[model samples]
Target: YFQSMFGPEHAEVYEAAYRGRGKSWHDEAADVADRIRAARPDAARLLDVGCGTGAHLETFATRFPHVEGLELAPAMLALARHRLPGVRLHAGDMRTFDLGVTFDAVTCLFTAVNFLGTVAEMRAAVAAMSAHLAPGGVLVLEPWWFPERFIDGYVGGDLVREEGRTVARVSRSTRQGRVTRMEERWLVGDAAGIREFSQVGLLTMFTREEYDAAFAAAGCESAYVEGWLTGRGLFVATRT
Candidate 1:
């Protein structure tokens, strides 16, 4: 299920691993803000769905007058809560959550929307996100690699040392038809010696057409942006 997107250790090292790889959450948030403003011009309120560790929201809050976060994992929510002290971070599922409030902009980054599993689930989650949008509100969704874009049987590795803790990660991504399964092995070390954990993540290889269908099902007009943080691309949609 999508609920198992990140295992315990995977969540533990999420921030450091991405940061270790030279990813700039701040710049990414700023870029997203630019995209939102380009479309709406005055998007001051924002909602971040699947806001892991609040990394993006932390910087997003600086740009938007008000911002909130929603996450499915309790551990990731806790990390976000700890990161953004005064922010309202909710524990909610992407496929089903009704905040009963509207925002000028709603976003699901880091390809979090990819975890919805199937095209039907993707439509449901997009509908939920769309329901929170005010009239003319924008929904910027970052998607995983498309079916034609996925590189099968890719293997990668990385290591990071921070605050006296060391983490090593090895990953293998393989595509099975329309599903891309990523299995990761993480080794962590500190004063207490070393520990190991393994995780398997499954994301759908939804095509661009599928993404457009999902947004259209949610009552939005969608456009594809070719350049973004990852080669997977971005879907910028607007409520009609």
Candidate 2:
């Protein structure tokens, strides 16, 4: 099972991430959605895999009429269901849950697929992604950059004055096979005071060779790996 580091409070950080103020998550999420749309211009049905709180789905629906949300977090799914009542939002694991249908394109954003824990788990996720893809379908995976680039003891800051919350995170990276382990420590607080929380996350990491191998094993063809700047890479694969 996957662990949610932020728990219910995770939504707080997401709101901050999307709040924009000066720098915003919407800008980046929008850019990613634009790229996704460009790849599948004729996309009639789109799957937002790991679609937390349906935020991405909401943004996507602005451009595409048919957008669906899928998430593993029941709490997040509840929020998504409430926000996008017209859209179909499912609460379950992506690795095994069957929607009983295929899609024109599927997307796993926010690097959520990285939480699968191990290479075996990732293989299963990919297998399922491919299994539900219609012919010429696209599965765009945006994984966190390789662990080699992760700065151990790295600290990041988040703030939301309006919400009366502030968060600070520190991360460490480790490797095992095709997966990387991220140890995150969070210092959270509001006008009241401060509390600390910590958790470990496992991310599926693949080099060009490892990615090619996984695609082949998934019975899909490697589309391409494009740079998204600042060391992030978008790896695309298509069903053969």
Candidate 3:
């Protein structure tokens, strides 16, 4: 759903939303990389699953010479190609991708796991990521809010500018069963004209025990840390 809404033209809008928040995936990647290096000092190759727009992969490239990105969205991959020339980027699903090789580290950040929609799907994705990790490799996952922490009927807005265009976006989040439905309304203005549209995204609320069990079932030594970055938590699992 996110990929379909974000065409080549809408990539700017996606980036604008990030700008409004005054945050970048690069910073998050840096912190994760530090943790990875501390665990495995000789870490080299890296794979970033669901690497949207390539910013996180770009940051990993600085630390690891061999960095590969896998994205599900072609439009996002197109933007990533423009940003990272000569870098290897593949289009594939996170739960089922055969790269024919393993890496020293694997990362699926930005709460991408939340979109799996089911515990079985999350386990499959974790198993896939674990299969791609070499000995002593680490898999870092930035997870979404837990079910207990989800605030129903939350509303927020932000403004972002790029080139000569400006966009204002309002978002509303409501809990339905075990999933959170996020509806975003965007008002974009530029020299061309003003346009309005809405996009809806869904994320599942998985508990910490579920993630721990999945990682253990995948044959990983996993640890969960509270308060990763701002509010969301992170799960770090190492392939033994």
Candidate 4:
């Protein structure tokens, strides 16, 4: 999945690309928080699955009294720990992990769920996330492009300079059946000298029915909100 793109060095370029793209991480977190509050009025405690570098958790910590994050990548988790020194951070796979507790809101954002290569894996991850949801909790999952909306071939690039480092990220994506094969390269230069790194990922494009079924089987009811994020959309579900 995206594991290849989260190495110590790659994580830096990814963060650069994320910021270069002007992704409204804080703004998006605010919106997601509001959406959760609208559904679960007393949503105070929260958990974020696949939280890369604790970007959204940084904002969530300020808004929620209790916040925790679960991540699979050690490199990303390291950054998250450094970023949020007080928040609880768990290192675990999304497919199977438990915190021995539940929360008012459980979220998986930035299309992180698409990294699952198969429907069964996605279902497992969804079920795992849903299992952590308290009664009346909200699960706001942002999904990658559905089959109907996926572009066969797409390209994205970003060059940014941050903290005395210059980083450039370029990615090309192509479709193979139900998977999006994304090949990306990163160029970095700084006091440590110049280095180049590349990462390729196969992201599955699950259908709307697949998403709905996953949620339903996980004991949740989901609603699709079109054009939620860059036309990739979101699955806002509530425990049933």
Candidate 5:
């Protein structure tokens, strides 16, 4: 679903749908980085997983002089390359990326873990992140809502305007067991032409207990905090 929907063809439209309309979580990265800095004051290296379009990467680059990012989509990577020309960005899956180097801090934000298909997959991803963290390193995770917090029949819409171009998006979500299926429809209109597309996304729901267990299994001492934007909670873990 991700590769097909977020390819090169739809990259510009995807950026217009999110970043162009102020949908980026620019402050989230700052808040997380601030917390990491306070705890690990000597931290000089940082890694951002699932860094779509490099919004968080840009923020982390300012805080940590040595910053790198891992992204799966080529289209998003292309935009990120242009956004941060000097930063190192790699193309790989978070669940099994072996960068052969460890950083002082690692962040997986914006509920990117929700895209994993299963709890075991989530654990592997967390372990992979942990493997890339040096001793006393910090891991910050912004997660989606748990199964109990998920709202069925949820409806949401967004409108983006840039110059003469405009984009409107509406989405509906339904729960199917442990997965929330989202049907998103978008319409883009401009002086040139009008285009429309539909995307279907399956986001898995992992309980708070599951998240705690995953972190622990990865040898992390973790804490869960509420209200990190949208009440989805934030997980801050330290490698011990």
Candidate 6:
């Protein structure tokens, strides 16, 4: 879907989308990295699940100096590895990636948890995150904004430019029951000129209760859900 159309070219588009909004993941993770740093001043290692392009690696790893990533998309991982040579990268699924060891912190941001596609699948992912936590470790995940707040027909404007190209993206969505059909139309131009690149995704929605249930089922006791930068959120859970 999105990976195919954007491929390696997505780097510029992603930068444009975030910096244009001033709500970039880099901005969001700055404060998040601070909080994570304050939580355990002596923390050493971290695992970033769904580490697309290692976008937040610099902020996270610069604080603790030890960072690893488990990513699902090779194209994205290629960019991530190239950018951060010190990062240990394993390409695989978020719910199933294994390294036979534990981490002091586990983070999956950018609402990548939405890929789970079902309540059961989401639970499995949560369990997997918990499974990798060492003693006193924390797992900070960010889920899509709750359905109650998913304003239908919401559209965002975008303008993207590369070395010799420009791209524009328009997004649309509609929700039916606990599912959302999201479509992004990317109007792109390169040396080949302009065309439309479309990404359509069907994502499952969950209430706070659902997320809380997942936490409890995974043996996590304390959970914090807070408004992150500009309406995005942070779901922080500590394993019991």
What's the distance in Å from true for residue 41, model 5?
0.8
Model 2 clash pairs are none
Q: Rate residue 43 of model 6 by lDDT.
A: 70
Native-referenced Cα lDDT, model 1: 0.86
Q: What local lDDT does model 1 show for residue 208?
A: 85
List per-prediction Cα lDDT, in the order shown: 0.86, 0.70, 0.85, 0.86, 0.84, 0.76
What tens digits encode model 4's per-residue C-alpha lDDT throughout 1-240?
333777887765566577666787898898888888899878899999999899999999888999999999999999999999999999999999989999999989988988988999999999999999987789998888744645578788888877888887778989877888889888888999998888888888788999999999999989988786455677899988
Candidate 5 ranges with C-alpha deviation above 4 Å = 1-3, 15-24, 146-150
Off by over 4 Å in 4: 1-3, 146-150
Candidate 6 wrong stretches, greater than 4 Å: 1-6, 9-12, 146-150, 161-163
- For model 3, the stretches where C-alpha displacement exceeds 4 angstroms are 1-4, 146-150
TM-score for candidate 2, residues paired by index: 0.79
Per-residue lDDT over 102-215 for candidate 3, one digit per residue giving the tens place of the 0 to 100 score: 999999988888888899999999999999999888999989884455556788898877688888888888997779887888889999999877777788978889999899
User: Candidate 6 — number of clashing residue pairs?
Assistant: 0
Ranking by TM-score: 4, 1, 3, 5, 6, 2
Residue pairs with backbone overlap in model 1: none
lDDT of 6 by residue, 73-167 (tens): 77788888988987789988876767888888889887788866789888888888888888677788877764455666667778866678887
TM-score of each: 0.94, 0.79, 0.93, 0.94, 0.91, 0.88
Whole-model lDDT, model 3:
0.85
- Please give the lDDT score for candidate 4: 0.86
